[PDB]
Amino acid sequence: SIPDIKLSSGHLMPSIGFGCWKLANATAGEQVYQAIKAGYRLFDGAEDYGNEKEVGDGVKRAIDEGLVKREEIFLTSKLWNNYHDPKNVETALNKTLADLKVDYVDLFLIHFPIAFKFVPIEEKYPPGFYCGDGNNFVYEDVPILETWKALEKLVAAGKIKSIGVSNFPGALLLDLLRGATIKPAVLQVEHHPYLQQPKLIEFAQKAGVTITAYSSFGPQSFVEMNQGRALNTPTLFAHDTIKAIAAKYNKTPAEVLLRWAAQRGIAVIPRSNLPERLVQNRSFNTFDLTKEDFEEIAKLDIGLRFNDPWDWDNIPIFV
Amino acid sequence: SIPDIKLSSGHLMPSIGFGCWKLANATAGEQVYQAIKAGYRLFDGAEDYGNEKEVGDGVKRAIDEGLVKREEIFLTSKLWNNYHDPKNVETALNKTLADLKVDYVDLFLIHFPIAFKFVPIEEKYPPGFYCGDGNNFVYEDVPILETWKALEKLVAAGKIKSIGVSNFPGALLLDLLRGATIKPAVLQVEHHPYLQQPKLIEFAQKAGVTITAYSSFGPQSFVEMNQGRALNTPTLFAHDTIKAIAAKYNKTPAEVLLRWAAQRGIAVIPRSNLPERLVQNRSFNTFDLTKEDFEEIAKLDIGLRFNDPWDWDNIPIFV
Numbered sequence: 001s002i003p004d005i006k007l008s009s010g011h012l013m014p015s016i017g018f019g020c021w022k023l024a025n026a027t028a029g030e031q032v033y034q035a036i037k038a039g040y041r042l043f044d045g046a047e048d049y050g051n052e053k054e055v056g057d058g059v060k061r062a063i064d065e066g067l068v069k070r071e072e073i074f075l076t077s078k079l080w081n082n083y084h085d086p087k088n089v090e091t092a093l094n095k096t097l098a099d100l101k102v103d104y105v106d107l108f109l110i111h112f113p114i115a116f117k118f119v120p121i122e123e124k125y126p127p128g129f130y131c132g133d134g135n136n137f138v139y140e141d142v143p144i145l146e147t148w149k150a151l152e153k154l155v156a157a158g159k160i161k162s163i164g165v166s167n168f169p170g171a172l173l174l175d176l177l178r179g180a181t182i183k184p185a186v187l188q189v190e191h192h193p194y195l196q197q198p199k200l201i202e203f204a205q206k207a208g209v210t211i212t213a214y215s216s217f218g219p220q221s222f223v224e225m226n227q228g229r230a231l232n233t234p235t236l237f238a239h240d241t242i243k244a245i246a247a248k249y250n251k252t253p254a255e256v257l258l259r260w261a262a263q264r265g266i267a268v269i270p271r272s273n274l275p276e277r278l279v280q281n282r283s284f285n286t287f288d289l290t291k292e293d294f295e296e297i298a299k300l301d302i303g304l305r306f307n308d309p310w311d312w313d314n315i316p317i318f319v
Numbered sequence: 320s321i322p323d324i325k326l327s328s329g330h331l332m333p334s335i336g337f338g339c340w341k342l343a344n345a346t347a348g349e350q351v352y353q354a355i356k357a358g359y360r361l362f363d364g365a366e367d368y369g370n371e372k373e374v375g376d377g378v379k380r381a382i383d384e385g386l387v388k389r390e391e392i393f394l395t396s397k398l399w400n401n402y403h404d405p406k407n408v409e410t411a412l413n414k415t416l417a418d419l420k421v422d423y424v425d426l427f428l429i430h431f432p433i434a435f436k437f438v439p440i441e442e443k444y445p446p447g448f449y450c451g452d453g454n455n456f457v458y459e460d461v462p463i464l465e466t467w468k469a470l471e472k473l474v475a476a477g478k479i480k481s482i483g484v485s486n487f488p489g490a491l492l493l494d495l496l497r498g499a500t501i502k503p504a505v506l507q508v509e510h511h512p513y514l515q516q517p518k519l520i521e522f523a524q525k526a527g528v529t530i531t532a533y534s535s536f537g538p539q540s541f542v543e544m545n546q547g548r549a550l551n552t553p554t555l556f557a558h559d560t561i562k563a564i565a566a567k568y569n570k571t572p573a574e575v576l577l578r579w580a581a582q583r584g585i586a587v588i589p590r591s592n593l594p595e596r597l598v599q600n601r602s603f604n605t606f607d608l609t610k611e612d613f614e615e616i617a618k619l620d621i622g623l624r625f626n627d628p629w630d631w632d633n634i635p636i637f638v
């Protein structure tokens with residue numbers, strides 16, 4: 001029932017997954033276990049989320065009861081900023097494999113085109129914005145291609161099935177494609193009605209790169225973080241346009257926001273933090289949006305971005 | 320007098336220059352010569368403008384008459400898109416050096432972060448959007464850093480005093496600073512009240528990279544090319560905000576548009592096609608815009624870009 005997408009790497013990836021950002025460590029396993037019982041097979045995690053160990057417990061439990069087999073679960077992780085230096089990539093990937101308790105990951109992405117100064121794992125993990133000098137941000141000179149090559153070596157070693165990037169703008173993705181042997185299979189970016197970036201999507205998809213959208217509900221995710229920008233932003237759930245369309249097909253505005261991405265061949269990893277939400281977030285492909293619909297949602301685009309490194313320390317990623 | 324800007328390379332660069340784009344071949348010579356007589360010392364040229372030979376004649380005459388010395392002329396040139404591949408960088412700089420009739424260029428910039436397929440000088444020069452296969456675009460897999468490394472060499476060889484980039488978005492500039500030994504000394508981008516990219520300026524400058532703005536008169540230059548987007552844009556010279564401010568200080572809209580950039584440490588290279596405009600475009604630093612003035616102009620920024628590779632062949636540089 002949950003459609004698959006063949007990545008450029010030849011491997012399949014579910015178009016509907018379970019998000020692991022802000023998934024409390026205390027119940028992450030229980031919740032990952034439940035997600036699996038509900039049909040979810042892909043889990044979007046990351047080293048920065050600091051719950052790969054619990055996410056692992058969840059997957060292991062499901063396997064031990066015989067509900068699924070390793071190859072049926074698609075695990076996605078992300079290399080954090082402090083580990084871009086070629087000599088530390090495998091080290092971080094090892095930690096991820098150790099916490100997840102697996103021999104490989106299905107998808108490993110460059111979390112950010114930012115390279116923080118290396119902080120030994122034993123000193124602090126996950127490092128977060130810690131750069132080894134108190135509260136100061138510190139960076140290290142490591143071009144993106146150097147990091148990508150280490151990743152390619154790790155793919156030949158069988159430690160990673162598919163590799164990709166996250167939070168990459170169009171010009172950086174183009175330049176990585178000029179020196180990549182294995183081309184990025186995925187581009188994961190903030191995608192929602194307030195930040196559509198239609199040209200980026202068009203380029204990537206035309207380039208054979210698969211798109212995975214995060215924060216499909218826009219500011220909602222950051223409101224729960226008490227962020228000034230997101231709070232000042234009208235929710236998509238109560239927006240006249242989304243509501244109208246939702247009423248025309250007799251659906252929920254939530255189902256509309258996800259269908260809007262799925263219908264265009266984009267993968268989603270909604271954050272289901274309630275049982276009822278687990279089901280809803282993977283049962284939305286029951287209707288079709290018309291050209292008119294897309295044109296209406298298209299008007300909501302104002303280029304509003306919630307996840308911006310510019311807020312951290314003025315990192316020019318999106319400027 | 321025209322204040323200078325000390326580049327990160329150590330060489331001084333005039334804060335005001337003479338643009339050479341669309342400067343006709345038959346009169347290019349005489350025009351450059353007149354500008355020198357008028358006080359201009361810097362000239363922004365480029366292989367793609369197809370007139371560096373005449374630009375050279377111009378400067379040669381000035382020198383021969385004892386008007387100026389080579390050391391007093393700041394010549395900027397740009398590496399066109401077909402010459403990114405390292406083995407072709409030197410030959411292209413060579414053709415520029417002979418055309419200009421000098422041993423070195425004060426500044427060489429990667430015109431665009433786009434690598435067209437190579438086309439021999441003899442087959443066609445300048446190639447423009449020509450790639451070697453009719454009207455089709457053909458690209459080479461050459462990462463920016465490779466081209467940049469080629470340039471660094473050329474500097475050590477005394478064939479270039481300073482290097483830099485042009486039309487590079489934030490993420491791209493950041494990655495280059497990661498693999499560069501000689502940091503880009505200058506960033507040249509489209510810059511005016513409709514496309515202010517304030518964060519880009521801030522980031523670049525705080526990094527010692529000097530900003531050189533182009534198309535300071537907004538849609539103006541591209542209107543003189545019958546470009547659809549430019550013809551449907553209210554001119555900056557008629558805009559109420561600029562009018563009000565100009566009247567206040569009794570200056571021309573043109574003078575206000577150039578001071579807006581200059582008072583903020585950004586260099587300008589207006590194209591002057593009239594003896595009077597030639598003089599005005601370099602005598603606008605006789606007043607200062609107030610904090611309120613900057614606030615009112617700030618409201619104009621709608622991010623309207625007139626020079627976009629997206630129009631050429633959907634090249635994702637600004638997405």
Ligand SMILES: NC(=O)c1ccc[n+]([C@@H]2O[C@H](COP(=O)([O-])OP(=O)(O)OC[C@H]3O[C@@H](n4cnc5c(N)ncnc54)[C@H](O)[C@@H]3O)[C@@H](O)[C@H]2O)c1
Binds near residue numbers: 045188281
């Ligand atoms: N690579 C990156 O930079 C990055 C950044 C952010 C998130 N992500 C990933 O993408 C996932 C989703 O993004 P997100 O964290 O912003 O969450 P989201 O946008 O999917 O959901 C945000 C919130 O909306 C609510 N919600 C979910 N389903 C709902 C429904 N049916 N009805 C009403 N409310 C509902 C929940 O309270 C939830 O916290 C993450 O879990 C993470 O794996 C990646």
Ligand SMILES: NC(=O)c1ccc[n+]([C@@H]2O[C@H](COP(=O)([O-])OP(=O)(O)OC[C@H]3O[C@@H](n4cnc5c(N)ncnc54)[C@H](O)[C@@H]3O)[C@@H](O)[C@H]2O)c1
Binds near residue numbers: 337364539
């Ligand atoms: N690196 C790049 O990608 C790039 C792209 C475009 C231009 N440039 C450079 O920057 C320069 C400036 O850009 P541009 O050529 O597009 O145009 P501009 O902004 O210098 O001026 C555009 C037009 O306005 C008019 N103008 C000039 N001075 C005026 C005045 N005082 N009052 C009223 N009208 C006036 C002229 O007709 C001129 O053609 C070029 O000469 C070129 O060297 C670089």
